[PDB]
mmCIF file of C-alpha atoms in Angstrom:
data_model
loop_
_atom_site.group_PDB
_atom_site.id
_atom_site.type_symbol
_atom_site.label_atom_id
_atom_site.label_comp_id
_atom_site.label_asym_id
_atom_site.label_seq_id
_atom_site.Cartn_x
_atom_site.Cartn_y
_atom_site.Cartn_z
ATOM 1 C CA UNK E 1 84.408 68.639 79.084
ATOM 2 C CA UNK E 2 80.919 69.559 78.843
ATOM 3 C CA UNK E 3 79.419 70.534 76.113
ATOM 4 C CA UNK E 4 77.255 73.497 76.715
ATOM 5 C CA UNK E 5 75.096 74.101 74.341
ATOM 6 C CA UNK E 6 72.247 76.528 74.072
ATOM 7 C CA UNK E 7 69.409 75.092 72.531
ATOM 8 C CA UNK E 8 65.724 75.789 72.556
ATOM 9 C CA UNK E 9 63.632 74.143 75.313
ATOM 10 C CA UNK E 10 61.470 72.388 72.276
ATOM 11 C CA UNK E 11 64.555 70.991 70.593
ATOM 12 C CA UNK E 12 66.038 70.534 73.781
ATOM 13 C CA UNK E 13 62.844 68.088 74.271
ATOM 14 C CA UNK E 14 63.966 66.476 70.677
ATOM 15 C CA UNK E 15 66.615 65.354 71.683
ATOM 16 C CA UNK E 16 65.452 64.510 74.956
ATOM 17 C CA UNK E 17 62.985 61.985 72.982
ATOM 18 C CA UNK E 18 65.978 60.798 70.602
ATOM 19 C CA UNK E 19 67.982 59.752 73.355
ATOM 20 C CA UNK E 20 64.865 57.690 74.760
ATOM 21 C CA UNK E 21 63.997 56.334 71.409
ATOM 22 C CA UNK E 22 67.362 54.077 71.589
ATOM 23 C CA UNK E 23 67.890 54.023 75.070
ATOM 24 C CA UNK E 24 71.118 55.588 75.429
ATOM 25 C CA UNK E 25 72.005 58.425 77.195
ATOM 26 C CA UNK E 26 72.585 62.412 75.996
ATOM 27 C CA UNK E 27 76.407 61.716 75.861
ATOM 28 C CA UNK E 28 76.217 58.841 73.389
ATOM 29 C CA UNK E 29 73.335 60.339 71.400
ATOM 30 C CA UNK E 30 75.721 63.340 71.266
ATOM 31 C CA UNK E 31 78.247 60.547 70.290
ATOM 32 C CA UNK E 32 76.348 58.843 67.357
ATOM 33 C CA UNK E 33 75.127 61.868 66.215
ATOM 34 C CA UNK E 34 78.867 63.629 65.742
ATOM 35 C CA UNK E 35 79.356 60.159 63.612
ATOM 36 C CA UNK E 36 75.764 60.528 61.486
ATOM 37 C CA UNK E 37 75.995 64.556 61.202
ATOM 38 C CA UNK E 38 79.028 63.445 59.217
ATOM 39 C CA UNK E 39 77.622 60.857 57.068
ATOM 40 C CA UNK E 40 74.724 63.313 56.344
ATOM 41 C CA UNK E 41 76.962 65.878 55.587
ATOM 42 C CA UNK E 42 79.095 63.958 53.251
ATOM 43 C CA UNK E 43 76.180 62.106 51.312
ATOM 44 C CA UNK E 44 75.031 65.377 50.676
ATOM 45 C CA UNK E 45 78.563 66.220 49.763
ATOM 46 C CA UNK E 46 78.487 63.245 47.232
ATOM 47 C CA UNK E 47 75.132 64.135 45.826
ATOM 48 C CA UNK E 48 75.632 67.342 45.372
ATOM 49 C CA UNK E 49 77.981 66.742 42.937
ATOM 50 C CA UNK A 1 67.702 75.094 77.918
ATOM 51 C CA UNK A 2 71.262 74.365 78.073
ATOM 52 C CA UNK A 3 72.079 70.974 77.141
ATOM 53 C CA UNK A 4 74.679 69.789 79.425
ATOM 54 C CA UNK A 5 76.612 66.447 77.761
ATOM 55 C CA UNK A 6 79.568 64.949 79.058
ATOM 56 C CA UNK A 7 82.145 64.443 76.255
ATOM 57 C CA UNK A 8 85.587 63.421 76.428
ATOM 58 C CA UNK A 9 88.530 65.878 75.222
ATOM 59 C CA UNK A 10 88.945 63.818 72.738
ATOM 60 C CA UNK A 11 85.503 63.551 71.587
ATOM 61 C CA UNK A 12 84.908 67.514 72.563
ATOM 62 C CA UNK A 13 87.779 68.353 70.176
ATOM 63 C CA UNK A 14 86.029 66.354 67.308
ATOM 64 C CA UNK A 15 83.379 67.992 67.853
ATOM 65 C CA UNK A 16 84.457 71.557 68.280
ATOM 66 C CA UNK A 17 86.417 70.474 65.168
ATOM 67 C CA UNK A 18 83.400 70.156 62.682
ATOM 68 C CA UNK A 19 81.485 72.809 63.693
ATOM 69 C CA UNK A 20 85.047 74.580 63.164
ATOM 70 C CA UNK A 21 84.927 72.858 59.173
ATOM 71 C CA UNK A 22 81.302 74.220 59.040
ATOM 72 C CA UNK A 23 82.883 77.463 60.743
ATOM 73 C CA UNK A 24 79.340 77.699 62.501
ATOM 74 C CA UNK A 25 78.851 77.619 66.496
ATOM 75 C CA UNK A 26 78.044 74.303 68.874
ATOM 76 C CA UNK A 27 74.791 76.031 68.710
ATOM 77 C CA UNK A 28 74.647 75.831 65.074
ATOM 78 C CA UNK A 29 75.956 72.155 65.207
ATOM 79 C CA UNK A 30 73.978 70.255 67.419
ATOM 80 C CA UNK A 31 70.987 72.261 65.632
ATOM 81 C CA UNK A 32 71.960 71.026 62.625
ATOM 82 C CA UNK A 33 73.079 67.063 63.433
ATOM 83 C CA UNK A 34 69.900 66.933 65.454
ATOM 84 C CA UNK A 35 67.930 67.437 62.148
ATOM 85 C CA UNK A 36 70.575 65.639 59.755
ATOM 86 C CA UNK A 37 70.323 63.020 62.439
ATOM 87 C CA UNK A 38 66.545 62.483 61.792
ATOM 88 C CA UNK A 39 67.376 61.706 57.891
ATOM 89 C CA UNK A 40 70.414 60.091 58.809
ATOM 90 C CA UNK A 41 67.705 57.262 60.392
ATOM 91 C CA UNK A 42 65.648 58.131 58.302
ATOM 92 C CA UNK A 43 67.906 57.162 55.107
ATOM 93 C CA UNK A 44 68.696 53.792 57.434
ATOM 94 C CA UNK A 45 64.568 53.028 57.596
ATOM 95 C CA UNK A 46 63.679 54.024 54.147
ATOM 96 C CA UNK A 47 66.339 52.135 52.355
ATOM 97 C CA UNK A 48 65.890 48.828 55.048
ATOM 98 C CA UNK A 49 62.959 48.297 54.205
#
């Protein structure tokens, strides 16, 4: 399924440039960034406390 | 504009899924992991080196 997202045209670009950076494509950015938006979210979930 | 990623049912549900534990929109989400992804590296780069 594709995941339709509305985003800005500017972060749209972002993540245009991410993507690049590596030199993946938008589905595996989307990929590794579902596994780091975790391990953001839960080291912030650890430091919080 | 729209981003338009090709993810896997499996992947799409996982997905769906955490911006269902944030209870936020896909929107919301990749707004948010696009960001936490930056200081996701960004812990990576600063702690490497």
């Amino acid at each position: 399924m594709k995941t339709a997202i509305s985003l800005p045209d500017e972060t749209f670009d972002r993540v245009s440039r991410r993507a690049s950076e590596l030199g993946m494509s938008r589905s595996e950015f989307f990929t590794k960034a579902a596994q780091r938006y975790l391990h953001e979210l839960d080291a912030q979930l650890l430091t919080g406390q």
